[PDB]
Design a protein around this nucleic acid. Structure first.
Ligand SMILES: Nc1ncnc2c1ncn2[C@@H]1O[C@H](COP(=O)(O)OP(=O)(O)O)[C@@H](O)[C@H]1O
Ligand SMILES: Nc1ncnc2c1ncn2[C@@H]1O[C@H](COP(=O)(O)OP(=O)(O)O)[C@@H](O)[C@H]1O
Ligand code: BEF
Ligand code: BEF
Lengths: 759, 759
DNA sequence: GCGACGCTAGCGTGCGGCTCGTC
DNA sequence: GGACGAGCCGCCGCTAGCGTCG
């Protein structure tokens, strides 16, 4: 069994290393950072792991019995070191010195304070502005999926019917850490797939149900709670749990978000989010992200969001003001969580103090209708307790302003006089002794002292007690000092105790405002997004979309591509029609299909869109077969299957070259069958193809569009007008030619084309 | 800004920072790492970068009239950060404090393609490339770590890239004409993501102007790095036409050196060498396969040698295990950079050399370096320490002078161990210590308790927390002596070390000759090991290609591979069949076999009679990876054009589905003209395609082959057997069926398929 | 016939703070 | 000749080695 450390030597394990091992083996998969004084240390293999991982120095902690390897980091840089460690894949186990030193039974009590897992981080220097989720998956009457953002308290979940939907929902939440139920972990088949499709860190957790509802959900939830309650090291700050339904929002499958680069890019470029997000606050960025993750289906609310956006678009003044003020707004939502969790530092409070000071100016600028809570009381007391620039930890310098604590002002009082004492003494001695240069100094090793140089050694009085000798200076002590020096130390010792209580007292004051803090967060967060979205409209020429059943876009732009190029706008009019798009490659097709999707996605999120006029329907889902079973033809078909099993007459469907990857024959066939399928389905379908045949089909709701090329001076020039009607001819041979194919070889190809043409 | 440091304050740069800025300014395009004690420091704006790129602790360097930000890395961790900093595109300038107003100067210059330090280099060659212009392109490569100096003159920018790619340079030097040509540079970067450095191009040597100029850039640049004359072997001018052509398309398609992601390259599978020189040799061969049968048959003979002599093969492979890189070691010695540790490595190698000569025999021609090995065994500790000062380097009894000094020194230490035993044996203080410190030298140390038992013959010099250190009259001389010696011991030991290092440096050639012979042996012996392990057979060369049961060398190491036969002879061999059956793999094994053979290795087959191809030109698919404007089609055609302009009747061409990516018509049209062009070309063409039309062109040298699939259990199972003659079916619809396409859609497709047969 | 306490010099990650040598 | 390198002690806590209760 386990209970032994690494290295060389016989005899027993020292009292300390003993305590080290005892905790170290309770968290087997965590790197234990042992708190020994002003350092976090690791011994044995764990010590070696550290040293190399962080390039630290490898030393040893020797004792009678044996000597073991040692590696440590100064607490000062804990988080600094933590971050690096985490990014490498380690879960940290922070073992701190609970009870103070001065009142310990020899060996200071040490227990693991908190656990640092990638998806349960609370340290604000370790978290992104974006939401950081922990996700749990379980089975038992369908698939159970739940999320928890330990830093904000967001706690939600749902149950999905397929393994497809689970992954979709999971992928739109971009979970930073996943808990897999027993069943799934065992099943080597599943796990492989999951681990392959979601390269996120996995972790063990008990899936004993919790609360009420579908068995699956109760297990996933219990898992989250169990795991997080362990890493926080105490009760969690949870928000009402949401058992939501993803059928109430627009469907954004994984293949759509990826292909559409909503959140992640394909060519290390920009993404829809990147381009759109100009929020100033973090909760704001979070909200906006939430909105994209699940676009609305309901006309009313969207037309609510669009009004407020339009508001700031008009009120340029106001818009720039609210944004000017939000620049200074801190993450109240998270700050409120840290407070409730009793983790709020003076730094946090200082920040809270600044944020709350902004409130009134926002109130004025927008009017008392904003509904912002009145925290003026809390705001003020903070300004009256904290220093203009709050320190990091309490025990150190001044945190509480002078004149706020009677008990503490008397302390700084006594200390000022006490220090002045030693100053007075210097001059008293410089006279009695006649030694002009005599200094009165201090230092940790010997305390307050009287200093005299060599030229005056024979001039020092009997009374002076030698304390320290130096190259050419000697330091003495008088009895008086000895006393007054301890009066200073006792004051200082009392000053910390109190300055820290006053802090804790004031903190708790802010902690009773957590809820108020939280609602201000929400209001300010929407405020942030609304102004942001408007900021984006103005800067980039977006316009308010109008919803209806007919989609009529006028001078369209792909919101991301136009960001890095003179983009040629284009039109579109669809209505449950089948719209084939033909024309030479490099012409514009796909930069057209994608454009359509994004426009739709922005509108149904409450944002203005990149066009001149846009009349859009409320799509129940955007499905794509763009870009991306051993073969390529099978993979693409697997997708068409999916798309075909969920698209409704209210889905926007985008097909790019479906039918490629096989024989010409099976090509057209499958394409035709599929095109006919989406046609009956009655969904809005854009199909970019190379089979001109599909354009001639005998379908009632079939429309045709095309892009073109003009063979001019230097070969072919591709314009991007998406003109009406089908493409006339193919430019393959022309392109090949342009690509350098030997002129005789091209000529031969032209002859063959014209021969086959003659039937 | 020269003389300017990003900081706050008026007054001049203090002495130190003044030095810093002086060097900093000499190597502008580099990040200057300044030594300060046990750290490498950066100041001003540079310090902010160092801090940024490595996420360090930004702080400040302060003097009365100026304070600037600083950041640094431990003198030790250097080579570890250098790597990160190098990979980040940083060029480093190292300044070391000339071994004791210090005197700091720029020791090295760390650059991607000029690295000399072993811990920063790969076993493989590391080149610095330069390209110039002047009747064709000038290409010259240099590997400062080896001395390898070669070059050639290319006629087309197309051939240029190729040769530049075969070598995978680490850093390139473009001539000014090229740097100014906005289009080229815009293209070069896009196609060759690698560090580009500036460097003079004043011609050097003889031959073409473009070569001499490139050759000059190299020399000029590299010397700046290795601060002084370079150690290089005779410039080797070569002709790419003297070897088999291996263009970048083929090198990637075939994954000779790098995988298309999803590990395992021909090289990794093939590479089984035990030394670096060997790995470099074998890589060299793979890079330029031979045309001439003479040499090839010579290599095959050597390989067979070890396939026969198992005891010899196994004995040599054992001995070479971990054997050091004599070639690089020789260079370091010649460059005057060899570390004590290096000499240590060298002797180990020399100790093993005698055993290898036993096994092989005089035939081989290894140099007898026993004298050098006896010397190194006589002077170096059984673990020289490059890092630990430079002392504890020469062993006792090697050099009398040094020996006498160390001995004298030691007595002193003894004395200061007697004063200890003697004193406490008079003062009763069995505690009293005799330690030393730089500040005062030697002393006496007494703890707090014994101040009452401390005699007056003493003279306190320094007091500490729990103890105080005293002095004595009869102790100074014995200090000013121990030191005068510790100094001399350094002065002398370094002399000897240098003397020793020099003796090794005089054997540079013997070391290079040894390295080289062993490299061959290592290679032949490894090509044998591989043949024996995976069943490779010696190939025979003749105008007909005949491979009996050949397997893809790389693919098989991962699965049960089905071997296949092939009989070609200047024929157009089409391969049809369902995807997922094996068409593309087949083309690739055929190509890899041809390569292994013309590299002098055995092949993965039973019988292999192969023609000596002049080049292997592939068009094995991928396309659209820059993934920009260019349609995949266009990219594929450019490649085809390349082949048509290169392929001769003695070329092995592999066309994989050429024609896809456009209209079905142009598709077949282009695909037929190409197939025809290659037919008349009379080159060995393997064309996997889906256009059955090609299957029936009826050309005199046309031939059919195909793979198939059966209908087992549920759907389709692909057997991997390449049968003679064409396929007659397409399993598109069948596959969509397995894909999960709605039965109706599938049925609709089939109805369509046949409905076309009425044609 | 030795378990139990007390006193207390000393080491040690990384790194402020203190000291000392020189123009 | 007050200021600038350049380098040692010790932090906070735990231990081992010594006396000693009796
Ligand atoms: N309307 C447009 N305005 C400006 N650039 C465009 C437009 N449409 C396409 N492009 C650009 O032309 C190139 C080819 O477009 P893509 O949609 O991929 O074409 P297709 O399927 O037609 O080949 C891309 O670089 C794309 O960004
Ligand atoms: N000779 C062979 N022996 C064993 N597996 C093979 C062989 N040839 C191909 N395969 C496997 O068959 C699958 C399809 O082969 P691939 O060459 O891609 O075929 P294609 O162009 O016919 O689709 C791959 O998984 C590949 O690794
Ligand atoms: F990118 Be497009 F569909 F060719
Ligand atoms: F790889 Be094969 F051409 F599908």
């Amino acid at each position: 069994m386990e209970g032994m450390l690494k290295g060389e030597g016989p005899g027993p394990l020292p009292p300390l290393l003993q305590q080290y091992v005892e905790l170290r083996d309770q968290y087997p998969d965590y790197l234990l950072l042992f708190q020994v004084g002003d350092f976090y240390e690791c011994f044995g293999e764990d010590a070696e792991r550290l040293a190399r991982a962080l390039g630290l120095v490898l030393t040893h902690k020797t004792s009678k019995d044996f000597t073991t390897p040692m590696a440590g980091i100064p607490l000062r840089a804990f988080e600094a070191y933590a971050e690096r460690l985490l990014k490498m894949g380690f879960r940290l186990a922070v073992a701190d010195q609970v009870e103070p030193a001065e009142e310990a039974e020899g060996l200071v009590r040490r227990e693991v304070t908190q656990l640092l897992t990638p998806g349960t981080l609370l340290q604000e220097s370790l978290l992104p502005r974006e939401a950081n989720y922990l996700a749990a998956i379980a089975t038992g009457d369908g698939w159970g999926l739940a999320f928890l953002d330990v830093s904000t308290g967001e706690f939600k979940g749902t149950v999905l019917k397929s393994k497809s939907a689970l992954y979709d929902e999971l992928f739109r939440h971009r979970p930073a850490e996943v808990l897999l139920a027993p069943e799934l972990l065992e099943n080597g088949a599943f796990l492989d797939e999951f681990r392959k499709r979601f390269p996120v860190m996995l972790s063990e957790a008990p899936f004993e149900p919790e609360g009420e509802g579908p068995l699956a959900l109760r297990r996933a939830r219990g898992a989250l709670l169990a795991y997080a309650q362990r890493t926080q090291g105490g009760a969690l700050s949870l928000q009402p749990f949401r058992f939501y339904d993803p059928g109430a929002f627009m469907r954004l499958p994984e293949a759509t978000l990826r292909a559409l680069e909503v959140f992640e890019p394909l060519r290390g470029q920009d993404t829809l989010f990147s381009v759109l997000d100009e929020t100033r606050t973090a909760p704001g960025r979070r909200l906006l992200q939430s909105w994209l993750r699940h676009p609305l289906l309901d006309r009313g609310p969207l037309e609510a969001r669009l009004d407020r956006v339009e508001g700031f678009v008009r009120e340029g003044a106001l818009r720039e003001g609210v944004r000017r003020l939000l620049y200074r707004l801190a993450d109240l939502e998270r700050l409120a969580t840290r407070l409730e969790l009793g983790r709020a530092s003076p730094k946090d409070l200082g920040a809270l103090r600044r944020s709350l000071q902004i409130l009134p100016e926002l109130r004025a600028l927008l009017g008392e209708e904003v509904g912002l809570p009145d925290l003026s009381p809390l705001k003020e007391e903070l300004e009256a307790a904290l220093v203009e620039d709050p320190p990091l930890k309490v025990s150190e310098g001044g945190l509480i302003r002078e004149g706020y604590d009677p008990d503490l002002d008397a302390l700084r009082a006594a200390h000022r006089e006490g220090v002045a004492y030693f100053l007075e003494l210097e001059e008293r001695e410089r006279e009695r002794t006649g030694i002009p240069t005599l200094k009165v100094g201090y230092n940790a090793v010997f305390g307050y002292y009287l200093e005299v140089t060599r030229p005056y050694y024979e001039r020092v009085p009997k009374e002076y007690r030698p304390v320290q000798t130096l190259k050419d200076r000697q330091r003495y002590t008088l009895p008086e000092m000895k006393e007054k020096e301890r009066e200073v130390y006792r004051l200082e010792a009392l000053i910390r105790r109190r300055e820290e209580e006053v802090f804790l007292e004031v903190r708790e004051r802010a902690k009773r405002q957590a809820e108020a803090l939280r609602e201000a967060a929400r209001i300010l967060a929407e405020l942030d997004v609304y102004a942001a979205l408007a900021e984006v409209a103005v800067r980039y020429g977006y316009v308010r979309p109008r919803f209806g059943d007919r989609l009529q876009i006028r001078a369209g732009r792909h919101p991301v591509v136009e960001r890095r190029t003179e983009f040629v706008p284009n039109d579109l009019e669809m209505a449950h029609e089948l719209v084939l798009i033909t024309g030479p490659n490099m012409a514009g097709k796909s930069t057209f299909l994608r454009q359509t999707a994004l426009i739709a996605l922005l509108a149904q999120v409450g944002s203005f869109v990149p066009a001149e006029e846009a009349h859009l329907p409320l799509f129940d889902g955007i499905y794509t077969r763009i870009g991306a079973g051993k073969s390529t033809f099978m993979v693409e078909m697997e997708e068409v299957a999916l798309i075909l099993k969920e698209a409704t007459e209210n889905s926007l469907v985008l097909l790019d070259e479906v039918g490629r990857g096989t024989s010409s024959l099976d090509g057209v066939a499958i394409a035709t069958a599929v095109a006919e399928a989406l046609h009956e389905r009655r969904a809005y379908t854009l199909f970019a193809t190379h089979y001109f045949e599909l354009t001639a089909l005998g379908l009632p709701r079939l429309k045709n569009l095309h892009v073109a090329a003009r063979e001019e001076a230097g070969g072919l020039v591709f314009y991007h007008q998406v003109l009406p009607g089908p493409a006339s001819k193919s430019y393959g041979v022309e392109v090949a030619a342009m690509a350098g194919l030997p002129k005789e070889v091209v000529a031969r190809a032209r002859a063959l084309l014209q021969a086959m043409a003659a039937r």
